[model samples]
Target chain A: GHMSPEREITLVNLKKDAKYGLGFQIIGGEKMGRLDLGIFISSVAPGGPADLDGCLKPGDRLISVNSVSLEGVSHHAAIEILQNAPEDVTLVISQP
Target chain B: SPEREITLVNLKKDAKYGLGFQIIGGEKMGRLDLGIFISSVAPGGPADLDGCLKPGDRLISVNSVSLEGVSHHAAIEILQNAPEDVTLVISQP
Candidate 1:
């Protein structure tokens, strides 16, 4: 049987910060669980703030921010938190 | 003898599982204000678990990162640092 090919996360052709923020976004889970609610860093803009953090990079999965877990929250809700967070807030992330 | 019917597994399903994909590709691309494109999510991925990102859903935000009046670069920067296990807000378009 011919199955459709799996799409690979190819970043070579895409320009950094070419379109939106130079990355892709994903929501990890629905009902809430350990390690749920993730945003993936597919690309990063050179010399950007996130890049300056040294922790954020392509393929890293965000886990929490200032210890706030995002599991099971709506995307808007999460964004709201980030928007309101202090400028010094730190984000925790995971890698596969 | 009846010819054996080969079951065609939805290729998208396989692709989703294989890549841990949560975002669906190849929808009719809609023009966005801040260079963002959103659509209904593929089942069983991170977006699906959030329960807000449903079929025929419009992604209002990515990674809880707001797009309201923000430049595309700003939005992307926020997305890059979004927490793992993100939740997206969706509604009828």
Candidate 2:
């Protein structure tokens, strides 16, 4: 097996089509039991904004959405951040 | 636009859980002093178990710290930094 030899964190910007929507889903949050206070992307809709961006993937922890830190946030709060994200969404993610 | 009577209730924070109630509205949200309104009483939490603070109840004060006309963040911070022994003055109308 070969080492990935890459940076852990990545900043990616995705253009949100209000009509098409920023298609993606997340699971596990600070308060949720899944990852012990860590939130990560569960799925990215095919051909959606996140899919088009091509940076996000399953198991990528969302460090922050836009500018709001996801640290210690509730599951509902994490959802709100992504749902209320601006037209241009900047995501700080870390690979699994 | 009419004021209601105030009720003083004392609560003690659970060693592990929070005060149960969530605070909404304050001067900082925008113009006008919206006042501090309580909402979202978490089940079995400190406030819920106390059976005093209720949703839509205006929190006039907490542990003698007046929340009457404070900003949203200020009031939230006050609660966040509240002592283990909590006291709240509420007005339900």
Candidate 3:
């Protein structure tokens, strides 16, 4: 049902103890939140698993998956975790 | 509800010399919007009154007067000519 990918991720804390997952603060005035991971994808190998999934399209903000909160995680860590997740995972995303 | 609506702001205390009010953005209208907002009320000031003019009451009107088309200039003029015993009418909601 699930698989763990052998990849390493490094995260740097931008802010302390945010309620919502990263990228721009919403709702509560004065009190705001921060984002975690920032990435830029160059290309998807032909016939790669990403190309196969058809869901990991280009230029989409990967806000969260399964509510795990992925704001400041590094790109390597994000790919490793997401790719290894169960086939039937619910992902939350923001675009533009 | 009154057909026309207007927004009001509190003038800082002792701003009697100049027009004591300024306008700023405020809460949007809602069905259950019935209340008053008051800032600091100095203790034992002449404007102090019992029952009717208590602190924190929504200042709905003054001297049985409501603010309808009452410009900032007119408001300041009223303050400059405030009587020794003025009646500050208030409403809730």
Candidate 4:
């Protein structure tokens, strides 16, 4: 029911290596007053995979992971998706 | 451009239920202000019932009492001492 305002989407590919995790904290759209679920990066860990990627910024909304849509997904469920991502994960992000 | 607006929300009067939300102060847009960031909301509480308040939403004013420059503790006191039905002005990023 809730979706962030439409905007340009960016794909960030993070390969599994010494630093695999996205290295960022996310807040679910439910917590942000939206009806539909959208994952938003609250902060990017310094010098981490996401930070090194240089494209993932704080306040960016995550549209999907590995092409698996996160629309209407719960906070915990979205986290599980990130946790279980394969060696190569593609994150679709929307700039705030 | 970012859309900013002031929304008035009415909260219930139960001391236990309170406002059904928590807040913290921090910087926003490179300004040193007491930005009220909603930390959590009690399910089925006054705020939750309102259906507009969210965890990341910021409180801009209370009963028209502007919170710009108000200290964190002072803002909490204002909310605690509010009347039965409190009018909260919030900002969503």
Candidate 5:
């Protein structure tokens, strides 16, 4: 049976800089097989915004960005959303 | 002796989701003539939404392409490169 996942979610802000940007690559999407859905942090670059924030890690599910829900969204769409987001970004993530 | 069942399925290709199913088993993986099989179906994907394709279902053919005795890479190429509206012939045990 399909059910909601039991998770611990966190709210954090990462100041995207020109040097490192958000400092991570994202994976998973509605069409991304095996990964299924939701944008997940693929890797956290050292000394980057997300890494310096120290709250994010690889495999963390990014639920929303600045209140833009990522549920069932495509990978490219998520990228565009993240790209167009404000410099000081609010991230809602689930620790899995 | 048990018999395998064959059926036809159609999945609409979406830019966001593609076909929305992961395939496994092929000649490269030593599947031999067993052909490729569905390993996983993504949620809200075309295949999942249609409720026809499932894990363990052997892919007999896709549209005009035959999956029997092919390499995994070739299988992926054919499936991924297909048109927007696709038809699948599957086998089930």
Candidate 6:
């Protein structure tokens, strides 16, 4: 029963030299009954880029990637964006 | 992700029933909607041990207390304030 009263925006810059991907899996909002909502982080890989960033976490919402909004994006579309993103990816996330 | 049929489970109160999860709310079909969805399950946690409440499962009720029309914070309070033993109705869609 934890509540996050203040909404915060976090920027994660995935380095090109990194060994792994963003280190997280996401679920699109359409699957969760909200087509307008951003994709949600389902799990963060341990010791990976997202985990090491320390700001990303499960439940956090991914608002955009490389400044492109994910609102109304389908699940496959969201996945394709993340998969095709540049190594120096910029992730704008809204913490839950 | 492909949509799955809704599933329900009744979790009994126990040391392993801490049931770690998260919930969020947003506009749904042009209206505000709150859902007790699981974002994460701690490894070896009660919820993880139960192996039913995985990430993305929406909690429908607690101990027969319907969550319909309940605010996100209010639902959290109800879950936190539940008695020792609780019954949960959850769905995957």
Q: What is the C-alpha lDDT of each candidate?
A: 0.41, 0.67, 0.35, 0.67, 0.72, 0.66
Off by over 4 Å in 5: A1-96, B29-32
lDDT of 3: 0.35
CA error at residue B72 for candidate 5, angstroms:
0.6
Report how closely model 1 matches the true complex, as a DockQ value. 0.04
DockQ score of each predicted structure, in the order shown: 0.04, 0.01, 0.01, 0.06, 0.03, 0.10
lDDT of 3 by residue, A1-96 (tens): 112112111111222112312222221111122232243333434444444455444554343444344444555556655555454455433332
Interface RMSD of each: 14.2, 19.7, 30.4, 9.5, 12.3, 9.0
Candidate 5, A1-96: lDDT as tens digits:
321235468998999989888987675433544434546665567778997888886556778899988876776788899899989899998763
lDDT of 4 by residue, A1-77 (tens): 12223445698987655664667767543332334545666556666678677887655667888888877776677
The local distance difference test score of model 5 is 0.72
lDDT of 6 at A36: 71
Q: Where does candidate 1 stray beyond 4 Å?
A: A1-35, B1-93
**TM-score for predicted model 3 compared with the true structure:** 0.27
The prediction achieving the highest TM-score against the true structure is: 6
lDDT of 5 by residue, B1-93 (tens): 234578999989977879988775423444446446665667778887888776556788889567767766788899888998999998753
Error of 1 at A34 (Å): 9.8
**lDDT tens per residue, model 2, B1-93:** 323457988888776667776665423434334456653566667776777665556677888867655776788899889988888887753
The whole-model C-alpha lDDT of candidate 4 against the native structure comes to 0.67
TM-score of chain B of each: 0.38, 0.82, 0.41, 0.82, 0.87, 0.72
Backbone clashes in model 3, listed as residue pairs: A22-A35, A23-A35, A36-A71, A36-A72, A37-A71, A37-A72, B34-B93, B35-B93
Predicted candidate 6 versus true structure: per-residue lDDT over A34-94, tens digit per residue: 4476578766666678767777766677888998888777666888998888888898887
Window of ten residues with lowest summed lDDT in model 4 chain A: A28-37
Which wins on TM-score, candidate 2 or candidate 3? Answer: 2
Candidate 2 stretches greater than 4 Å from native: A1-7, A29-37, B1-93
| Per-residue lDDT of candidate 3, residues B27-47 (tens digit) | 342221212333434444433
